[PDB]
RNA sequence: GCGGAUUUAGCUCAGUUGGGAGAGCGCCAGACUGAAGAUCUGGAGGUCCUGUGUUCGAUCCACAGAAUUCGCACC
RNA sequence: GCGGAUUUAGCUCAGUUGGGAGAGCGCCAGACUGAAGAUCUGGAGGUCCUGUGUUCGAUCCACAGAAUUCGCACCA
RNA sequence: GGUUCUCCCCGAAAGCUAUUUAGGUAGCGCCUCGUGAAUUCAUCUCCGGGGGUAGAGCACUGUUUCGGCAAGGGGGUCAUC
RNA sequence: GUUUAUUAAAAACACAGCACUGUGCAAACACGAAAGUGGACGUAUACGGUGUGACGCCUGCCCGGUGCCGGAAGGUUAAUUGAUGGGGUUAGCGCAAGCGAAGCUCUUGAUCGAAGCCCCGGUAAACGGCGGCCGUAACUAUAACGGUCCUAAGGUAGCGA
RNA sequence: UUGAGCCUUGAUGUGUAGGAUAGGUGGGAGGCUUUGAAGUGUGGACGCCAGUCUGCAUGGAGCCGACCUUGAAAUACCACCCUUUAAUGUUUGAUGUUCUAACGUUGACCCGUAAUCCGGGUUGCGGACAGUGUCUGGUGGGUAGUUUGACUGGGGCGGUCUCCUCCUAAAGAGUAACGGAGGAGCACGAAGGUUGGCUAAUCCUGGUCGGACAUCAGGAGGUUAGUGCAAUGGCAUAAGCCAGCUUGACUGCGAGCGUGACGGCGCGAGCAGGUGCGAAAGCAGGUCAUAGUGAUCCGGUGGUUCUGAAUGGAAGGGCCAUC
């Protein structure tokens, strides 16, 4: 965004529903590392990806 | 992607006329062409897609059967190209000329399980050319495994730059560019590799079609 | 008073992840010289300022203290 | 990160038939010398940048990643 | 810079936040004037305990000194600092 | 000398040579919008920079820095020139979702590219500049004699307030 | 002479088996045959030897192919496929190299003209030069400009509004000074949870591989402990703990309000959907929290049933993302 060791943003989409966000991540350490089960649909916590596809 | 059924569609309509449907003596045919780019030896991207033509054309595919003794009566009347016993399959174990017959020209090998001895009289002269077997039914009730096979084409590429298969005959373009875009979903669901394009065309008994794409 | 360098080999001084202590030079040996330096090849040469803490481990860093020392404060 | 090239010894780098992986300077040891330098010769020398796929066989062919690196995006 | 005739009560205008402030600025009053209203509001006697202004101790942590010895540590001597 | 009448009355200095320097000549300067008039009725020993400090000697040296510029072996990467990729705008092809060509156009930092300047060459009038600790003379201590530190470096061509 | 395209003209290959001089990528199993069309047979002449040339047959017989053999791999019959680059045609450009009706004539002859401007033609010169108009480059204080906080025991310094704790300053609140101590320019691939778990040291004595030490079984039972940079404070039915299971930290409204000056900052009875957490009682919006950003105006940008001066597409706006 602007630095190097710097708290990023980075686009995270949904595993159904469409619907993209961010807050944090950190180029700092391994990279590997997440998705999760969550839903801005609200209805069923199944699959997300994050930004990262893990 | 690779294509999409209009720029199919338009490029059928001119494969199916005159310019490149150039007549020896019978309802002739058209195909679907794809060759790549950087394909080379190390697996990701090869093919096998063995495909019933979504919309059938003129003329039907090349069937061989196996069926076993209480399937037989029904399987007599699915129309098969050719047809061998579960037991006869015991005298062919030597006869090279009937077997490169089969080979060279039929098309799909449908075989019962009992029938194994099938995975040995066949694979060296049918295998080189790429077109394979498979394990029929059962079933007396056989009848829509039989038309599958006899209106499928496939994939034929273990490591080669280019596929090439029938998808059409004579008479009507427009349906036959649904079974075009089902080959190429076959390969890009296949191989997601996308930029590996050299080249899509169509192609009659001769003359090929460089497609508006 | 604040901030800073600094108390690291005879001599000039380098050095630090934060775990080895360095080099031009000087000494000494090995020999070449009756001898010594050069030039040589090998060995060696440390108040790492002190305390404390972090810490695997402090020469280092932070904190507290000595003591030199540098600029500005002073009119 | 866009794309390309590059990474093989301490460093510069050969490495394109895929079959033995190395030269140069310098390092080392002998010869030479009175000692070294220089000349001469032998001897040393690797995360083949990473790690799998393909291969009978991989520095070599494919790809994902990295660092070295050239030009380069940019009206949040 | 300076109230160009008179009169009477409310009426310190003259301050909290500040302000790439320097007698300059946003709302604002403790103001009046026009609507509106309730025990609304203040001191007392009372309810009820948090405060730490005092004060006081030696409790802590820091220690006065004087006794009495707390494998602490000094001076002397044999001794190999 | 009568010079900046107006602070000094020169204790300012206007001289005047010259290495270099501006221009092989519609020459430099251009006041004026159009002059081509100074310089010219004239040539780089005429005329202009920036100065000069009688006269005559004398201008050591020293290029680290910064001037002055001048160049081209080659890198930074602009007008100039435009590999392309992505689109727009749209025929053809689609019961639809939508694909999708010329032409026209949007948009590349394609690839050259040295003003500067890394650079390369020369500058004594271009900018200013002369380093410290450890050991010292048949006496104090003078400070010749000393090993060196990648430190840019210690008073030098004098006469001594 | 040199750039970009295009085959009019070319040409960069020997190893064996295959009666035989085999780039490929591929379909399938047949392909030609009107006699002046096809091979197939056999001489003869050339040589940069890998090229061709010229004669004469026979010829509706069948011959080339999966079909029979061989091998690293087929070859009959069509599709597909031109480039590293030459020769020259056919599109077409551009630096040098120049000649010279541009041009400039502030050079001369001739000429109007007893003429300094000026008229004009021959000549003589150089030369597409000049010219200026933009874009890129710095070059220097040659017009014009500002005198930009305030803090002032009068100024030059050193320190602060910031957003922050402890002093200092007179309790609801505060009131510095070139004053006294010390400060944020940020923090997770978890320092993420809902169950469950408690008892640790130091030193005394034990004992493989010591020579301070590190899991240990017991002293005494001491409420003699710990703190990853900073700090002050937590306070123990432990949050420090740490192994299993595994990452709600919901989309939407809220009586009631705590309140202020436009942002804002705080949370909650109760209602929805079904939301995930649970045996059951039942709980709640994430790193230990204190330190972390934009007056807002302009920007940019990605999505849309929100619109858009007669429309229809639609600029531009709305919604809210994204900064």
Known sequence: AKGIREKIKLVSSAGTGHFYTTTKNKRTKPEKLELKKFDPVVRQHVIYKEAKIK | ?213
Request: charge should be positive; glycine fraction near 4%.
């Open chain 2, 1 to 213: 992607m690779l294509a999409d059924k209009e720029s199919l569609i338009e490029a059928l309509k001119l494969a199916l006329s005159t310019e490149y449907n150039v007549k020896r003596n019978f309802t002739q045919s058209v195909e679907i062409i794809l060759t790549f780019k950087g394909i080379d030896k190390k697996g990701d991207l090869k093919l096998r897609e063995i495909v019933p033509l979504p919309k059938q054309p003129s003329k039907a595919k090349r069937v061989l059967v196996v069926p076993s003794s209480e399937q037989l009566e029904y399987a007599k009347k699915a129309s098969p190209k050719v047809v061998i016993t579960r037991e006869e399959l015991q005298k062919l174990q030597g006869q090279k000329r009937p077997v490169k017959k089969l080979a060279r020209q039929n098309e799909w090998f449908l075989i019962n399980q009992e029938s194994a001895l099938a995975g040995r009289i066949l694979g060296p002269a049918l295998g080189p050319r790429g077109k394979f077997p498979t394990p029929l039914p059962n079933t007396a009730d056989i009848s829509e495994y039989i038309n599958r096979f006899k209106r499928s084409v496939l994939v034929k590429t273990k490591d080669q730059p280019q596929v090439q298969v029938f998808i059409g005959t004579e008479d009507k373009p427009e349906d036959l560019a649904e079974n075009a875009i089902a080959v190429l979903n076959a390969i890009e669901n296949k191989a997601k590799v996308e930029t590996n394009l050299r080249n899509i065309y169509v192609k009659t008994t001769g003359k090929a079609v460089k497609v508006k794409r």
